[PDB]
Design a protein around this ligand. Structure first.
Ligand code: SZE
Ligand code: ZN
Ligand code: ZN
Ligand code: ZN
Length: 459
């Protein structure tokens, strides 16, 4: 019930063109042996090179699509393709590299995986659409053995070096030549009818097939991502903290209280329609406004049609007051809205590439977010930075260099000079806002929003 048993059956139909005459009855134990790996009954935390769908989902940050195409079987050169976009050519003697021997190819494989995964995961998961040559070629760049630790640190071992007989994690594997103890999963064992391209092209129109191994590796991991995260959503799975997850979420909550609290003071809306997370709370609990909630889970597939969220017959008058769409992804936002929308294009360790232009955002939980579409925001404008505070000016306590800013909306700045307390709070809030923007989130607001209306709240 925890791992994939080596005695589970492996459907070999998808392997009989590269491997003609392959037995119909086959288990993982025989398949691993067939690949050139003697497991020799080793109870050292590595029960099987292959894993379950649930284990692959728990370790999605490790997924690397892998495909091998025959450029002509120890006679023919192989094209090794990865979801990173790399194409290596191995000779037995998008990045498309020329034909080189296995000893140099295996060195580049360790470099590529270590640079790709060092800040993502403690392992690699080869996501396959197994036809034969990828499983047979693994003996040339993979060495297996008991679970281990890094020679330079305490992280688990993910690489091996024959030159120095030592093991290393993804950070200390410079010059290492073997992938040590990788994991893998064959998507073809999930019961797909038809080939990779047909199943991929059913959900994703963003990846095309140039017939190169990398294109297939991308389509494989994409289709695996769709199956596990787009159409199957398991928000119960927690994920390790691998970066600024805590500061990003703290920043978002701070920005959220700030933007909503200020909009309510500037335009004095009677009602706020909060559309999104069914578990969300009032971000501004002391606000005068009538707060109404609408439940809508994170749409993993496509953005919600505003016509299905509001219409079809709650105040029902969504045009009265302001709508708050905090991370609720809709096709076109109404003009009376405050919106936080995650930009799927952002380059970060928390954002993994998704399906159909979307992205898998892993921050405590995995959220496949649909593609960012700038046209969702035609009735709105980008929210400009500001810091508002109605709190008393009282230091209570962080050194000081006089703060002079137009965007620090406080009583002290109204009356001339900014005080030390609001000056610390301004720089802390500025850092949180910067944290939030860089983490790929974008803020938008109704066109009539003006920060000038906030000075009046000081009388
Ligand atoms: C749980 N886990 C997965 C991710 N992981 C790392 N992530 C980022 C940087 C360095 C790492 F070792 C290693 C680990 O212990
Ligand atoms: Zn290490
Ligand atoms: Zn795709
Ligand atoms: Zn002040």
């Amino acid at each position: 019930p925890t791992h994939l048993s080596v005695d589970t059956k492996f459907k070999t139909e998808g392997l009989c063109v590269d491997i003609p005459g392959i037995p119909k009855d086959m288990t993982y134990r025989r398949l691993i042996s067939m690949m050139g790996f003697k497991m020799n009954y080793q109870v050292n935390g590595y029960p099987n090179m292959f894993i379950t769908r649930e284990e692959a989902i728990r370790h999605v940050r490790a997924w690397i699509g892998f495909d091998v195409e025959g450029c002509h079987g120890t006679n023919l050169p192989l094209q090794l393709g990865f979801s990173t976009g790399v194409n290596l050519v191995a000779v037995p003697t998008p990045l498309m590299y020329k034909g080189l021997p296995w000893n140099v190819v295996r060195i580049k494989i360790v470099q590529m995986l270590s640079d790709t995964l060092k800040n993502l995961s403690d392992r690699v998961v080869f996501v396959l659409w197994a036809h034969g040559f990828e499983l047979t070629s693994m003996k040339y760049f993979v060495k297996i053995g008991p679970e281990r630790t890094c020679c330079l640190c305490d992280r688990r071992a993910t690489c091996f070096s024959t030159a120095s007989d030592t093991y290393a994690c993804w950070h200390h594997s410079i010059g290492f030549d073997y992938v040590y103890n990788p994991f893998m999963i064959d998507v073809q064992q999930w019961g797909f009818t038809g080939n990779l391209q047909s199943n991929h092209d059913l959900y994703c129109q963003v990846h095309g097939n140039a017939h190169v191994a990398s294109c297939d590796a991308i389509m494989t991991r994409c289709l695996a991502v769709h199956e596990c995260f787009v159409k199957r959503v398991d928000w119960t799975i927690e994920y390790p903290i691998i970066g600024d997850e805590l500061k990003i979420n703290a920043a978002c909550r701070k920005v959220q209280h700030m933007v909503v609290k200020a909009a309510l003071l500037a335009d004095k809306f009677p009602v706020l329609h909060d559309i999104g997370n069914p578990k969300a709370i009032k971000c501004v609990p002391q606000a005068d406004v009538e707060w109404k909630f609408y439940d809508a889970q994170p749409c993993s597939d496509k953005a919600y049609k505003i016509e299905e969220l509001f219409y079809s017959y709650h105040s029902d008058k969504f045009t009265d007051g302001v709508c708050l769409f905090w991370n609720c992804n809709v096709d076109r936002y109404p003009a009376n809205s405050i919106v936080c929308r995650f930009d799927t294009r952002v380059l970060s360790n928390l954002n993994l590439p998704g399906c159909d232009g979307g992205s898998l955002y892993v921050n405590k939980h995995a959220f496949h977010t649909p593609a960012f579409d700038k046209s969702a925001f035609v009735n709105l404008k980008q929210l400009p930075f500001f810091y508002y505070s109605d709190s008393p000016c009282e230091s209570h306590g962080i050194d000081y260099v006089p703060l002079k800013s137009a965007t620090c909306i406080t009583r002290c700045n109204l009356g001339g000079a900014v005080c030390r307390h609001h000056a610390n709070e301004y720089r802390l809030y500025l850092d949180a806002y910067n944290m939030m923007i860089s983490a790929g989130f974008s803020l938008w607001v109704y066109k009539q929003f003006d920060t000038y209306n906030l000075w009046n709240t000081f009388t």
